[PDB]
Structure formats: structure tokens, C-alpha cells
Amino acid sequence: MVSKGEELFTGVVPILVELDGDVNGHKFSVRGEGEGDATNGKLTLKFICTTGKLPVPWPTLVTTLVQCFSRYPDHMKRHDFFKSAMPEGYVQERTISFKDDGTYKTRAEVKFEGDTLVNRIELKGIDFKEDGNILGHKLEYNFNSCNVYITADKQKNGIKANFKIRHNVEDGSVQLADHYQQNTPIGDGPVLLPDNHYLSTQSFLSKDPNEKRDHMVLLEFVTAAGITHGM
Amino acid sequence: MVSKGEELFTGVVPILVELDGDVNGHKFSVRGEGEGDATNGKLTLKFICTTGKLPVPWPTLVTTLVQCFSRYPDHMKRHDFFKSAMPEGYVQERTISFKDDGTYKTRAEVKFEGDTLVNRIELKGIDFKEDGNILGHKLEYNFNSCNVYITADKQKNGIKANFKIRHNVEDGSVQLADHYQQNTPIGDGPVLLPDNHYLSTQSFLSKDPNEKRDHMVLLEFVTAAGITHGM
């Protein structure tokens, strides 16, 4: 039984991402466009800094810049909160604590505006070191993680996640980014509260050789796993 | 340019797996049947121990029981050795060293026999402890890993991999299984030697409630990543 939220994702869906950021008083905007193919768990986006030089490394923004495009295998569809909240969508909040450096706090609404899945984000960054790995642009241009665990919000409709991102630093050290995440449905419609499970994400960060603006080309594959009940 | 080996995988392909095993002199056979969908990197197999009780835990056999069904994204197809060797196929050899316990040595041929992709394996296990985690059946019925790195065989046509599998033990400890892998093409036809990359595998192990024989139902999703050149 393909749920109504699920039905919105059965084809290729256009994506718009808008981020307005302030890190230590550096104002920037990022705009991304592309498409999501939830059936294959495939994301293809190109992000532009529309205000000039991005004052943080692109890799620090990957997690902030649409978990509704996760490939949930058939036997796990009952645990897909992200599509069940659509089209009205969900609020996604994070604290991202960079070890020995500053903090990002993000608030986003992920929802349909007509035929497009929109992720509209506000980001505030404080306590960054002027010559640390983030404001100093010392992070390698890549992105790796090994499973983000998703859990039901146990006081209310929604999900939570906490996970650690390891950013390679150019000197061969590692910059830790501890993520705390809470998602709440925007509407009052029924949603699916999941059992514990995880999302596995592979990421490819490249450049468009003809693009002069500061930018990130991003390809992702995402698959849910960690529940075997009901197959 | 869809290579001829690639073309053999564009649909759903039937799979046959045959394993003849000897662990500490316990003779067993495993037979598996199902299908591979390389376009989605999806494997669905059911394995039977045709000789009675499997004398090792099913999870210890998952890696031995067809990397040609990996989803290689478009920009990485030139690095897919496993399909390039088809239909004549490849020899896949492993040593699997169980920490504080015995060793498996495996030799398999992965090739097409008519319309079916066949994995035919010989397994020899020695130096197992009669009451260790393997012959004692103390391993949880599940399977997790975080990336297997694939490299070109640098003296000859083929690939190598070494990776560590962590099997959960029922007391809450961990049984390490260190895998060393070498694959060689069976034919003399051109093959693709890859740049360094990895395979990401999600695994679901269940039971058929109507199956009385010792068995494992296995669903897998596999995606290649770790190269961004040429997108």
C-alpha cells in the first residue's frame, strides 16, 4: 500500500535549496537546484554561493543542504517519516558542534511548493576561530560518513538523529563535527513514527569547470537499513 | 558506452550459489538461488544447508556466498572489474582469519552458465575452537560493515581487497574476521583495472517461517563510491 506521501516521490522530483547564513558575522547565501529520485535514493544538485566567496568550506554545509529522497526498501516503508510528512513537510533543526571551534545552529523547512521539494534554511555560526580549519579553509573537498541512526521522537511526532562527521584536514588531521538533529511535522496529518534504523549515504563532491562562481556539484546515493521485520 | 560485460547485467539476472565446505572435518553443502539487479545494486537470495545443520554461523558465510551485482554509478563504470570479466568470469580467493579462532580459505569461480550467474565455492576451515564463537554458534544473526576498499592487482589483471568484518557475539563482545581477497579473470579478454574505490553494502538476514531446513534469507544493496573523476 503506497502511502500518499510516498506517491509524491515515485518519479524524478525537482529540488530547490535556499540557505541564508551568518558565521561570525560573515553573511552569505547559497542556492542549489537539481533533482531527487527516491526510488534510486539518488540526489544530483549544484550549489552556488550567490554572495561571492563562501566563508566556510563546502563540506561543512553538506548535511545542512532532504532525507525524504532516501531509498527505503519495501519491507521498511512503514518507517519512512520523511515522505509521510509530505506535502506539508517537516522542520529540521540541528546543532553542529565543530570540536575546538564554533557551532552552527540550523532551522529548515522541507516541504513541497508546487511540484518542487524545497529545503529553506537559516544557519547561524558563532565562536569560530579566524584561522581555524573552518574560517581558514583547511578542509579537504570531500565527504564520508558510516551510517546515521534515526530514532522516533519519544515525546512527540517526529525523528531525532545524532551522528559525528569526520572532515579530513589538509595537514592529514581530522576535524570532528558532532550533529544533533530533531525533525517535526509541519502539518497535523498522520505520520509514520519509525523503529530504530539508519541511513547510509555515499557523496561525490566535484566542480563545474565552466562555473566561475564559488560552487559545489554534489551527487549522493542514500539507502535505509537496520530493520529486517516484515520481509 | 555500455561495455559488453555491463550489458549482461542491465536486467534481473538469476543467481545460483553452490558452496562445498569442510570446517575442522565437518562436511557441509550450501545451495542458494535468487536474482541480482545490478542497476539497483540489489541481491535477493535464499540459502539452504542441504546436508543438515550448518556447522558454522550463517553470518560467517555472507562474504563467501557476487560483487558483479554492485551498482557502479555512471561516472565510475570504467572502474567495474567484476562485470568487465563476464561472461567468462573471475576466480575469487579469500583467507578469512577469525581472531583467537580458526581460518577459512575459499576458492570460487564467478561466471555465467547460460543465463545464470554462478558462484561455485570450495571452503576449508581449520584450527577452529570446538566451543569458540564459530563452532559454538555464539554469533548474532545479522551482518554490518562500513566500506570494502577495492584496489587493482598491481602485478597482474585483477583486484584485491582486505577488510575487517565485526560479528556481534551473543554475550555483547565482538568476533573479528580479517578478510584478504584476490580476484583474477578466467579469460584472456580485455578487462577494466580500477583506480582505488570502495563498495558500500547493506545486508538483511531473515528466516522463511515455512522453511524447516537450516537456511538464510538475504537481501543486499551495494553501491560503489570513492572516485569523483569524470562527472
UniProtKB/Swiss-Prot annotation, chains A, B:
Record's comment on post-translational modification: Contains a chromophore consisting of modified amino acid residues. Maturation of the chromophore requires nothing other than molecular oxygen.
Reported impact of residue 67 to L: In RSGFP4; increases fluorescence and shifts the major exitation peak to 489-490 nm
Consequence of substituting residue 200 to F: In H9; increases fluorescence at 395 nm excitation
Biotechnology: Green fluorescent protein has been engineered to produce a vast number of variously colored mutants, fusion proteins, and biosensors. Further generation of mutants led to more stable proteins (at 37 degrees Celsius for example) with brighter fluorescence and longer fluorescence lifetimes.
Outcome of substituting residue 196 to S: In EBFP1.2; shifts the excitation and emission spectra to shorter wavelengths and increases quantum yields compared to BFP
Mutation effect (residue 201 to I): Suppresses the 475 nm excitation peak, leaving only the shorter wavelength peak at 399 nm. In H9; increases fluorescence at 395 nm excitation
Outcome (variant: residue 201 to H/W/F): Results in significantly red-shifted excitation and emission maxima
Effect annotated for changing residue 174 to A: In mut2.1; shifts fluorescence lifetime from 3.03 to 2.50 ns
Organism: Aequorea victoria (Water jellyfish)
Consequence when changing residue 67 to M: In Citrinine; leads to excitation and emission peaks of 516 and 529 nm, respectively
Impact reported for residue 201 to Y: Gives rise to yellow-emission variants. In EYFP; leads to yellow fluorescence, folds faster and more efficiently at 37 degrees Celsius and has superior solubility and brightness
Matching Pfam families: GFP
Effect of residue 220 to G: Suppresses the 399 nm excitation peak, leaving only the longer wavelength peak at 475 nm
Protein name per the record: Green fluorescent protein
Function: Energy-transfer acceptor. Its role is to transduce the blue chemiluminescence of the protein aequorin into green fluorescent light by energy transfer. Fluoresces in vivo upon receiving energy from the Ca(2+)-activated photoprotein aequorin.
Subunit-level organization: Monomer.
Chain's gene name: GFP
Keywords from the named record: Chromophore, Luminescence, Photoprotein
Family stated for the protein in its record: Belongs to the GFP family.
Phenotype when changing residue 173 to G: In GFPA; leads to enhanced fluorescence at 37 degrees Celsius. In Venus; leads to yellow fluorescence, improved maturation and reduced environmental sensitivity
Superkingdom, natural source: Eukaryota
GO biological process: bioluminescence; generation of precursor metabolites and energy
Tissue expression summary: Photocytes.
Impact reported for residue 147 to K: Increases fluorescence at warmer temperatures such as 37 degrees Celsius. In Esmerald; leads to brighter fluorescence. In VisGreen; leads to brighter fluorescence
